[PDB]
Amino acid sequence: VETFAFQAEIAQLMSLIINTFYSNKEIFLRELISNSSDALDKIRYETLTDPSKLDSGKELHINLIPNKQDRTLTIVDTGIGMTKADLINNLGTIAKSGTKAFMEALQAGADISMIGQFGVGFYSAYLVAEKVTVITKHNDDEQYAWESSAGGSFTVRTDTGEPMGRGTKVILHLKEDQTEYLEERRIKEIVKKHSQFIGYPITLFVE
Template sequence: MTVLEQGTITIHTENIFPIIKKSLYTDHEIFLRELISNSVDAIQKLKMVSYAGEIDGDVGDPEIKITIDKDKKTLSISDNGIGMTADEVKKYINQVAFSSAEEFIQQYQKEADQQIIGHFGLGFYSAFMVAQKVEIDTLSYQSGASAVHWACDGSPAFELSDSERTERGTTVTLTMQEEEQEYLEPSRIRQLVKSYCDFMAVPIKLEDEVINKHEALWKKSSRDLTKEDYLEFYRYLYPFQDEPLLWVHLNTDYPFLLDGILYFPKLKPDVDVTKGQIKLFCNQVFVSDNCEEVIPNFLMPLRGVIDSP
Protein backbone atom coordinates (compact mmCIF):
# COMPACT_ATOMS: atom_id res chain seq x y z
CA MET A 1 0.00 0.00 0.00
CA THR A 2 1.37 3.39 -1.01
CA VAL A 3 1.18 6.18 1.55
CA LEU A 4 0.07 9.29 -0.29
CA GLU A 5 0.36 11.79 2.52
CA GLN A 6 0.88 12.08 6.27
CA GLY A 7 0.05 14.98 8.53
CA THR A 8 -1.61 16.25 11.67
CA ILE A 9 -5.36 16.71 12.11
CA THR A 10 -6.27 20.36 12.60
CA ILE A 11 -8.62 21.31 15.42
CA HIS A 12 -10.17 24.78 15.45
CA THR A 13 -10.47 25.94 19.05
CA GLU A 14 -13.35 28.28 18.30
CA ASN A 15 -15.39 25.22 17.27
CA ILE A 16 -14.32 22.75 19.95
CA PHE A 17 -14.67 25.08 22.95
CA PRO A 18 -18.49 25.36 22.76
CA ILE A 19 -18.67 21.56 22.61
CA ILE A 20 -16.57 21.26 25.77
CA LYS A 21 -18.78 23.79 27.55
CA LYS A 22 -22.07 22.15 26.64
CA SER A 23 -21.16 18.47 26.61
CA LEU A 24 -18.46 18.05 29.24
CA TYR A 25 -20.98 16.77 31.81
CA THR A 26 -24.60 15.70 31.61
CA ASP A 27 -25.63 17.68 34.69
CA HIS A 28 -24.67 21.34 34.88
CA GLU A 29 -24.64 21.21 38.68
CA ILE A 30 -21.41 19.18 38.50
CA PHE A 31 -19.49 22.44 38.02
CA LEU A 32 -19.53 23.14 41.77
CA ARG A 33 -18.10 19.72 42.59
CA GLU A 34 -15.30 20.26 40.08
CA LEU A 35 -14.35 23.73 41.31
CA ILE A 36 -14.40 22.68 44.96
CA SER A 37 -12.28 19.64 44.06
CA ASN A 38 -9.74 21.99 42.48
CA SER A 39 -9.67 24.03 45.70
CA VAL A 40 -9.13 20.89 47.79
CA ASP A 41 -6.27 19.90 45.48
CA ALA A 42 -4.69 23.34 45.89
CA ILE A 43 -4.77 22.94 49.67
CA GLN A 44 -3.39 19.39 49.53
CA LYS A 45 -0.57 20.57 47.27
CA LEU A 46 0.27 23.30 49.77
CA LYS A 47 0.56 20.66 52.50
CA MET A 48 2.92 18.62 50.33
CA VAL A 49 5.09 21.65 49.62
CA SER A 50 5.11 22.48 53.33
CA TYR A 51 6.13 18.92 54.26
CA ALA A 52 8.97 19.22 51.75
CA GLY A 53 10.28 22.20 53.74
CA GLU A 54 9.68 24.79 51.03
CA ILE A 55 7.51 27.05 53.18
CA ASP A 56 8.64 28.83 56.31
CA GLY A 57 6.17 29.07 59.17
CA ASP A 58 2.61 27.87 59.59
CA VAL A 59 0.40 27.65 56.50
CA GLY A 60 -2.73 28.23 58.59
CA ASP A 61 -5.98 26.31 58.78
CA PRO A 62 -7.25 25.14 55.39
CA GLU A 63 -10.67 26.29 54.28
CA ILE A 64 -12.81 26.89 51.23
CA LYS A 65 -15.26 29.79 51.11
CA ILE A 66 -18.26 30.12 48.82
CA THR A 67 -19.62 33.64 48.34
CA ILE A 68 -22.81 34.67 46.57
CA ASP A 69 -23.48 38.19 45.28
CA LYS A 70 -26.99 38.30 43.82
CA ASP A 71 -26.67 41.93 42.76
CA LYS A 72 -23.63 41.17 40.61
CA LYS A 73 -24.96 37.69 39.78
CA THR A 74 -21.67 36.13 40.84
CA LEU A 75 -20.68 32.96 42.65
CA SER A 76 -17.13 32.74 44.03
CA ILE A 77 -15.14 29.78 45.34
CA SER A 78 -12.03 30.76 47.32
CA ASP A 79 -9.27 28.70 48.90
CA ASN A 80 -6.08 29.37 50.84
CA GLY A 81 -4.11 26.74 48.96
CA ILE A 82 -0.95 26.81 46.90
CA GLY A 83 -2.01 29.51 44.43
CA MET A 84 -0.57 30.02 40.95
CA THR A 85 1.97 32.23 39.23
CA ALA A 86 1.29 33.86 35.86
CA ASP A 87 3.28 31.12 34.12
CA GLU A 88 1.27 28.42 35.90
CA VAL A 89 -2.01 30.06 34.89
CA LYS A 90 -0.85 30.07 31.27
CA LYS A 91 0.22 26.44 31.52
CA TYR A 92 -2.64 24.88 33.47
CA ILE A 93 -5.63 27.12 32.65
CA ASN A 94 -4.98 28.19 29.08
CA GLN A 95 -4.19 24.66 27.90
CA VAL A 96 -7.36 22.56 27.85
CA ALA A 97 -6.94 19.06 29.34
CA PHE A 98 -3.46 19.82 30.70
CA SER A 99 -3.53 18.72 34.33
CA SER A 100 -1.00 19.84 36.92
CA ALA A 101 -1.69 16.82 39.13
CA GLU A 102 0.60 14.22 37.58
CA GLU A 103 3.49 16.64 37.19
CA PHE A 104 3.10 17.86 40.77
CA ILE A 105 2.93 14.35 42.25
CA GLN A 106 6.09 13.34 40.40
CA GLN A 107 7.89 16.37 41.82
CA TYR A 108 6.78 15.65 45.39
CA GLN A 109 6.69 11.85 45.41
CA LYS A 110 7.85 11.56 49.03
CA GLU A 111 4.92 13.66 50.21
CA ALA A 112 2.38 12.08 47.84
CA ASP A 113 0.27 10.52 50.61
CA GLN A 114 -1.88 13.65 50.30
CA GLN A 115 -4.66 12.77 47.87
CA ILE A 116 -4.90 14.81 44.69
CA ILE A 117 -8.34 14.56 43.10
CA GLY A 118 -7.95 15.99 39.60
CA HIS A 119 -5.97 14.22 36.89
CA PHE A 120 -7.43 15.24 33.54
CA GLY A 121 -7.40 19.05 33.50
CA LEU A 122 -10.99 19.42 32.31
CA GLY A 123 -12.96 20.07 35.49
CA PHE A 124 -12.29 23.81 35.55
CA TYR A 125 -14.01 24.26 32.20
CA SER A 126 -17.27 22.92 33.61
CA ALA A 127 -17.69 26.45 35.00
CA PHE A 128 -18.55 27.66 31.51
CA MET A 129 -21.61 25.42 31.44
CA VAL A 130 -23.29 27.84 33.86
CA ALA A 131 -21.26 31.06 33.63
CA GLN A 132 -21.09 33.72 30.95
CA LYS A 133 -17.76 34.87 32.37
CA VAL A 134 -15.16 33.22 34.59
CA GLU A 135 -12.43 35.08 36.47
CA ILE A 136 -9.49 33.87 38.53
CA ASP A 137 -7.58 35.84 41.13
CA THR A 138 -4.60 33.95 42.47
CA LEU A 139 -1.39 34.46 44.44
CA SER A 140 1.26 31.75 44.60
CA TYR A 141 2.96 30.59 47.80
CA GLN A 142 6.32 31.25 46.13
CA SER A 143 8.37 34.05 47.62
CA GLY A 144 8.17 37.24 45.59
CA ALA A 145 5.27 36.01 43.45
CA SER A 146 2.85 38.56 42.02
CA ALA A 147 -0.91 38.16 42.12
CA VAL A 148 -2.57 37.38 38.79
CA HIS A 149 -6.04 38.03 37.36
CA TRP A 150 -7.37 35.85 34.52
CA ALA A 151 -10.68 36.40 32.75
CA CYS A 152 -12.54 34.65 29.93
CA ASP A 153 -16.04 35.17 28.53
CA GLY A 154 -16.41 31.64 27.19
CA SER A 155 -14.62 32.24 23.91
CA PRO A 156 -11.06 31.02 23.27
CA ALA A 157 -9.86 34.56 24.06
CA PHE A 158 -8.67 35.46 27.57
CA GLU A 159 -7.12 38.36 29.47
CA LEU A 160 -4.24 38.06 31.92
CA SER A 161 -3.41 41.01 34.16
CA ASP A 162 -2.22 42.03 37.61
CA SER A 163 -4.48 41.30 40.57
CA GLU A 164 -5.01 43.16 43.83
CA ARG A 165 -5.09 39.91 45.80
CA THR A 166 -2.80 39.99 48.85
CA GLU A 167 -3.39 36.56 50.42
CA ARG A 168 -2.04 33.25 49.17
CA GLY A 169 -4.60 31.11 47.36
CA THR A 170 -7.12 31.29 44.55
CA THR A 171 -10.60 32.70 43.98
CA VAL A 172 -12.69 31.61 41.00
CA THR A 173 -15.59 33.97 40.28
CA LEU A 174 -18.44 33.00 37.98
CA THR A 175 -20.82 35.55 36.50
CA MET A 176 -23.83 33.32 36.06
CA GLN A 177 -25.87 32.98 32.90
CA GLU A 178 -29.46 34.21 33.09
CA GLU A 179 -30.86 30.67 32.90
CA GLU A 180 -28.56 29.45 35.69
CA GLN A 181 -29.63 31.84 38.46
CA GLU A 182 -30.64 28.94 40.71
CA TYR A 183 -26.98 28.62 41.70
CA LEU A 184 -27.17 32.02 43.37
CA GLU A 185 -29.51 30.60 46.01
CA PRO A 186 -27.75 29.55 49.25
CA SER A 187 -30.15 26.63 49.71
CA ARG A 188 -29.20 25.23 46.30
CA ILE A 189 -25.48 25.53 47.06
CA ARG A 190 -25.94 23.81 50.42
CA GLN A 191 -27.80 20.98 48.74
CA LEU A 192 -25.05 20.49 46.14
CA VAL A 193 -22.26 20.58 48.71
CA LYS A 194 -24.08 17.99 50.81
CA SER A 195 -24.61 15.80 47.74
CA TYR A 196 -21.13 15.92 46.25
CA CYS A 197 -18.64 17.41 48.71
CA ASP A 198 -19.95 16.46 52.14
CA PHE A 199 -16.97 14.27 53.02
CA MET A 200 -14.15 16.32 51.53
CA ALA A 201 -11.30 16.72 53.98
CA VAL A 202 -11.44 20.54 53.97
CA PRO A 203 -14.12 22.66 55.69
CA ILE A 204 -16.37 24.40 53.16
CA LYS A 205 -17.98 27.63 54.35
CA LEU A 206 -21.03 29.50 53.12
CA GLU A 207 -22.26 32.59 54.96
CA ASP A 208 -19.59 31.98 57.66
CA GLU A 209 -20.93 28.50 58.40
CA VAL A 210 -19.25 25.16 57.68
CA ILE A 211 -21.73 23.30 55.47
CA ASN A 212 -19.97 19.96 54.93
CA LYS A 213 -19.36 17.13 57.35
CA HIS A 214 -15.70 16.97 56.18
CA GLU A 215 -14.95 13.70 57.95
CA ALA A 216 -15.03 10.43 56.02
CA LEU A 217 -15.59 7.62 58.51
CA TRP A 218 -14.37 5.02 56.03
CA LYS A 219 -10.92 6.63 56.00
CA LYS A 220 -10.43 5.85 59.67
CA SER A 221 -9.19 2.58 61.12
CA SER A 222 -11.90 0.25 62.40
CA ARG A 223 -9.92 0.00 65.64
CA ASP A 224 -10.68 3.66 66.33
CA LEU A 225 -14.43 3.37 65.78
CA THR A 226 -17.24 2.23 68.02
CA LYS A 227 -20.52 0.51 67.22
CA GLU A 228 -22.31 3.81 67.72
CA ASP A 229 -19.96 5.52 65.22
CA TYR A 230 -21.00 3.04 62.53
CA LEU A 231 -24.70 3.30 63.38
CA GLU A 232 -24.62 7.09 63.44
CA PHE A 233 -22.94 7.13 60.04
CA TYR A 234 -25.58 4.75 58.66
CA ARG A 235 -28.38 6.96 59.97
CA TYR A 236 -26.72 9.95 58.33
CA LEU A 237 -26.53 8.18 54.96
CA TYR A 238 -29.94 6.53 55.16
CA PRO A 239 -32.25 8.47 57.48
CA PHE A 240 -35.50 6.91 58.71
CA GLN A 241 -34.26 3.38 57.96
CA ASP A 242 -34.08 0.42 60.33
CA GLU A 243 -30.68 -0.25 61.82
CA PRO A 244 -28.49 -2.62 59.78
CA LEU A 245 -27.85 -6.21 60.78
CA LEU A 246 -24.07 -5.88 60.51
CA TRP A 247 -21.35 -4.09 58.57
CA VAL A 248 -17.91 -4.61 57.04
CA HIS A 249 -15.15 -1.98 57.06
CA LEU A 250 -12.95 -2.21 53.95
CA ASN A 251 -9.35 -0.99 53.72
CA THR A 252 -7.63 -2.82 50.87
CA ASP A 253 -4.70 -2.13 48.57
CA TYR A 254 -4.75 -5.36 46.52
CA PRO A 255 -5.99 -6.23 43.95
CA PHE A 256 -7.82 -2.89 44.14
CA LEU A 257 -7.04 0.20 46.17
CA LEU A 258 -10.25 1.06 47.96
CA ASP A 259 -11.80 2.00 51.29
CA GLY A 260 -15.38 1.74 52.36
CA ILE A 261 -18.05 0.56 54.74
CA LEU A 262 -20.73 -1.86 53.57
CA TYR A 263 -23.88 -2.39 55.62
CA PHE A 264 -26.19 -5.41 55.52
CA PRO A 265 -29.69 -3.92 55.92
CA LYS A 266 -32.85 -5.58 57.09
CA LEU A 267 -34.64 -6.39 53.85
CA LYS A 268 -38.36 -5.88 53.49
CA PRO A 269 -40.63 -7.68 50.99
CA ASP A 270 -41.26 -4.51 49.00
CA VAL A 271 -37.57 -3.60 48.60
CA ASP A 272 -36.19 -3.73 45.06
CA VAL A 273 -32.88 -5.57 45.59
CA THR A 274 -31.85 -4.95 41.97
CA LYS A 275 -31.55 -1.21 42.61
CA GLY A 276 -28.20 -0.51 44.20
CA GLN A 277 -27.88 1.88 47.12
CA ILE A 278 -24.11 1.83 47.54
CA LYS A 279 -22.59 5.29 47.15
CA LEU A 280 -19.46 5.46 45.00
CA PHE A 281 -16.78 8.03 45.87
CA CYS A 282 -13.42 8.97 44.38
CA ASN A 283 -11.03 10.49 46.92
CA GLN A 284 -14.00 11.46 49.13
CA VAL A 285 -15.81 13.12 46.22
CA PHE A 286 -19.26 11.69 45.51
CA VAL A 287 -19.51 10.22 42.02
CA SER A 288 -22.70 8.17 41.83
CA ASP A 289 -25.15 5.94 43.66
CA ASN A 290 -26.15 4.28 40.40
CA CYS A 291 -23.45 1.62 40.40
CA GLU A 292 -25.04 -1.32 38.60
CA GLU A 293 -22.09 -1.52 36.21
CA VAL A 294 -19.55 -1.46 39.05
CA ILE A 295 -21.13 -3.44 41.88
CA PRO A 296 -21.75 -7.20 41.39
CA ASN A 297 -25.41 -8.24 41.43
CA PHE A 298 -25.06 -10.24 44.63
CA LEU A 299 -23.97 -7.06 46.48
CA MET A 300 -26.89 -4.95 45.27
CA PRO A 301 -28.94 -5.35 48.47
CA LEU A 302 -26.10 -3.83 50.50
CA ARG A 303 -25.78 -0.18 51.45
CA GLY A 304 -22.83 2.00 52.33
CA VAL A 305 -19.82 3.64 50.73
CA ILE A 306 -16.99 2.55 48.44
CA ASP A 307 -14.15 4.99 47.80
CA SER A 308 -11.43 4.36 45.23
CA PRO A 309 -8.89 6.85 43.83
Protein backbone atom coordinates in the same frame (compact mmCIF):
# COMPACT_ATOMS: atom_id res chain seq x y z
CA VAL B 1 -3.35 43.23 29.68
CA GLU B 2 -2.15 40.22 27.71
CA THR B 3 -4.52 38.21 25.51
CA PHE B 4 -3.84 34.54 24.75
CA ALA B 5 -5.55 32.06 22.45
CA PHE B 6 -6.84 28.84 23.90
CA GLN B 7 -5.04 25.77 22.50
CA ALA B 8 -7.25 24.27 19.74
CA GLU B 9 -8.45 21.23 21.71
CA ILE B 10 -9.19 23.37 24.76
CA ALA B 11 -11.29 25.74 22.65
CA GLN B 12 -13.09 22.70 21.17
CA LEU B 13 -13.74 21.40 24.71
CA MET B 14 -15.15 24.76 25.81
CA SER B 15 -17.51 24.81 22.82
CA LEU B 16 -18.64 21.24 23.61
CA ILE B 17 -19.40 22.31 27.17
CA ILE B 18 -21.29 25.42 26.12
CA ASN B 19 -23.19 23.78 23.25
CA THR B 20 -24.06 20.24 24.38
CA PHE B 21 -27.57 19.91 25.84
CA TYR B 22 -26.88 18.63 29.35
CA SER B 23 -29.16 19.45 32.25
CA ASN B 24 -26.88 18.28 35.09
CA LYS B 25 -25.04 21.64 35.22
CA GLU B 26 -24.61 21.49 39.02
CA ILE B 27 -21.44 19.40 38.59
CA PHE B 28 -19.48 22.61 38.02
CA LEU B 29 -19.36 23.11 41.79
CA ARG B 30 -18.01 19.61 42.46
CA GLU B 31 -15.26 20.23 39.87
CA LEU B 32 -14.17 23.61 41.22
CA ILE B 33 -14.14 22.27 44.77
CA SER B 34 -12.07 19.29 43.56
CA ASN B 35 -9.51 21.67 42.07
CA SER B 36 -9.44 23.67 45.34
CA SER B 37 -8.95 20.42 47.31
CA ASP B 38 -5.98 19.52 45.05
CA ALA B 39 -4.45 22.99 45.61
CA LEU B 40 -4.94 22.66 49.38
CA ASP B 41 -3.39 19.15 49.31
CA LYS B 42 -0.39 20.62 47.53
CA ILE B 43 0.33 23.49 49.93
CA ARG B 44 -0.23 21.13 52.87
CA TYR B 45 2.22 18.65 51.32
CA GLU B 46 4.88 21.34 50.73
CA THR B 47 4.47 22.67 54.28
CA LEU B 48 5.36 19.27 55.75
CA THR B 49 8.98 19.91 54.78
CA ASP B 50 8.96 23.72 54.80
CA PRO B 51 6.57 25.27 57.37
CA SER B 52 7.48 28.76 56.09
CA LYS B 53 5.31 28.00 53.04
CA LEU B 54 2.37 28.79 55.37
CA ASP B 55 3.72 32.26 56.30
CA SER B 56 1.22 33.63 53.73
CA GLY B 57 -1.63 31.99 55.67
CA LYS B 58 -1.99 28.95 57.91
CA GLU B 59 -5.67 28.24 57.38
CA LEU B 60 -6.50 25.64 54.67
CA HIS B 61 -10.13 26.05 53.64
CA ILE B 62 -12.71 26.68 50.93
CA ASN B 63 -15.35 29.45 51.07
CA LEU B 64 -18.41 29.66 48.78
CA ILE B 65 -19.64 33.25 48.40
CA PRO B 66 -22.83 34.10 46.51
CA ASN B 67 -23.56 37.76 45.61
CA LYS B 68 -27.01 38.37 44.19
CA GLN B 69 -26.32 42.04 43.45
CA ASP B 70 -23.36 41.19 41.18
CA ARG B 71 -24.88 37.89 40.02
CA THR B 72 -21.68 36.07 40.96
CA LEU B 73 -20.78 32.89 42.85
CA THR B 74 -17.15 32.93 44.05
CA ILE B 75 -15.21 29.84 45.17
CA VAL B 76 -12.23 30.86 47.31
CA ASP B 77 -9.52 28.51 48.57
CA THR B 78 -6.23 29.02 50.41
CA GLY B 79 -4.35 26.40 48.41
CA ILE B 80 -0.94 26.75 46.75
CA GLY B 81 -2.21 29.24 44.16
CA MET B 82 -0.79 29.81 40.70
CA THR B 83 2.05 31.95 39.38
CA LYS B 84 1.52 33.85 36.11
CA ALA B 85 3.30 31.03 34.24
CA ASP B 86 1.05 28.46 36.01
CA LEU B 87 -2.10 30.30 34.83
CA ILE B 88 -0.94 30.38 31.21
CA ASN B 89 0.38 26.81 31.22
CA ASN B 90 -2.54 25.21 33.06
CA LEU B 91 -5.57 27.33 32.16
CA GLY B 92 -5.57 27.41 28.45
CA THR B 93 -2.44 27.15 26.33
CA ILE B 94 -1.61 23.41 26.74
CA ALA B 95 -3.81 20.31 26.21
CA LYS B 96 -2.75 17.07 27.80
CA SER B 97 -1.99 14.13 25.54
CA GLY B 98 -5.28 12.22 25.06
CA THR B 99 -7.53 15.24 24.88
CA LYS B 100 -8.50 14.66 21.26
CA ALA B 101 -9.65 11.08 21.94
CA PHE B 102 -11.48 12.20 25.05
CA MET B 103 -13.51 14.75 23.09
CA GLU B 104 -14.35 12.13 20.49
CA ALA B 105 -15.70 10.02 23.35
CA LEU B 106 -17.86 12.94 24.55
CA GLN B 107 -19.30 13.33 21.05
CA ALA B 108 -20.18 9.63 20.84
CA GLY B 109 -22.24 10.03 24.00
CA ALA B 110 -19.90 9.85 27.00
CA ASP B 111 -21.15 11.94 29.91
CA ILE B 112 -19.84 15.52 30.06
CA SER B 113 -19.30 14.94 33.78
CA MET B 114 -16.24 12.81 32.89
CA ILE B 115 -14.26 16.05 32.35
CA GLY B 116 -13.38 15.83 36.07
CA GLN B 117 -11.76 12.40 35.89
CA PHE B 118 -9.86 13.35 32.75
CA GLY B 119 -8.44 16.45 34.45
CA VAL B 120 -10.15 19.35 32.64
CA GLY B 121 -12.94 19.97 35.16
CA PHE B 122 -12.25 23.71 35.50
CA TYR B 123 -14.01 24.27 32.16
CA SER B 124 -17.24 22.99 33.70
CA ALA B 125 -17.47 26.60 34.96
CA TYR B 126 -18.88 27.44 31.48
CA LEU B 127 -21.94 25.26 32.14
CA VAL B 128 -23.26 28.14 34.28
CA ALA B 129 -21.04 31.23 33.76
CA GLU B 130 -20.94 33.68 30.88
CA LYS B 131 -17.56 34.91 32.17
CA VAL B 132 -15.07 33.46 34.66
CA THR B 133 -12.43 35.52 36.51
CA VAL B 134 -9.68 33.65 38.36
CA ILE B 135 -7.71 35.74 40.90
CA THR B 136 -4.65 33.94 42.27
CA LYS B 137 -1.61 34.41 44.52
CA HIS B 138 1.24 31.87 44.74
CA ASN B 139 4.11 32.35 47.22
CA ASP B 140 6.57 32.69 44.33
CA ASP B 141 4.79 35.42 42.34
CA GLU B 142 2.54 38.47 42.60
CA GLN B 143 -1.26 38.41 42.44
CA TYR B 144 -2.71 37.84 38.95
CA ALA B 145 -6.12 37.79 37.30
CA TRP B 146 -7.03 35.42 34.45
CA GLU B 147 -10.35 36.00 32.70
CA SER B 148 -12.40 34.59 29.86
CA SER B 149 -15.84 34.70 28.31
CA ALA B 150 -14.78 31.85 26.00
CA GLY B 151 -14.83 32.80 22.33
CA GLY B 152 -11.32 31.33 21.97
CA SER B 153 -9.24 33.68 24.12
CA PHE B 154 -8.44 34.60 27.71
CA THR B 155 -6.57 37.53 29.30
CA VAL B 156 -4.00 37.73 32.07
CA ARG B 157 -3.07 40.86 34.00
CA THR B 158 -1.50 41.71 37.35
CA ASP B 159 -4.30 42.15 39.89
CA THR B 160 -4.60 45.28 42.06
CA GLY B 161 -7.69 44.16 43.97
CA GLU B 162 -7.82 43.10 47.61
CA PRO B 163 -4.64 41.07 48.32
CA MET B 164 -5.29 37.39 48.88
CA GLY B 165 -2.38 36.18 50.98
CA ARG B 166 -2.20 32.89 49.08
CA GLY B 167 -4.68 30.85 47.06
CA THR B 168 -7.20 31.13 44.26
CA LYS B 169 -10.61 32.77 43.87
CA VAL B 170 -12.83 31.67 40.97
CA ILE B 171 -15.50 34.27 40.27
CA LEU B 172 -18.40 32.90 38.21
CA HIS B 173 -20.39 35.62 36.48
CA LEU B 174 -23.56 33.58 36.15
CA LYS B 175 -25.74 33.33 33.07
CA GLU B 176 -29.14 34.97 33.53
CA ASP B 177 -30.95 31.62 33.72
CA GLN B 178 -28.51 30.10 36.24
CA THR B 179 -29.31 32.18 39.32
CA GLU B 180 -30.39 29.13 41.30
CA TYR B 181 -26.66 28.82 42.18
CA LEU B 182 -26.87 31.99 44.30
CA GLU B 183 -29.46 30.35 46.62
CA GLU B 184 -28.32 29.04 50.00
CA ARG B 185 -30.54 25.94 49.83
CA ARG B 186 -29.36 25.04 46.34
CA ILE B 187 -25.67 25.39 47.11
CA LYS B 188 -26.10 23.45 50.35
CA GLU B 189 -27.84 20.63 48.45
CA ILE B 190 -25.07 20.43 45.85
CA VAL B 191 -22.27 20.39 48.37
CA LYS B 192 -23.98 17.62 50.33
CA LYS B 193 -24.60 15.55 47.20
CA HIS B 194 -21.16 15.84 45.58
CA SER B 195 -18.61 17.30 48.00
CA GLN B 196 -19.60 16.17 51.46
CA PHE B 197 -16.34 14.53 52.43
CA ILE B 198 -13.71 16.89 51.10
CA GLY B 199 -10.76 17.00 53.51
CA TYR B 200 -10.87 20.77 54.19
CA PRO B 201 -13.68 22.89 55.68
CA ILE B 202 -16.16 24.34 53.21
CA THR B 203 -18.04 27.39 54.45
CA LEU B 204 -21.10 28.53 52.56
CA PHE B 205 -21.49 32.30 53.17
CA VAL B 206 -24.97 33.79 53.20
CA GLU B 207 -26.48 37.15 52.24
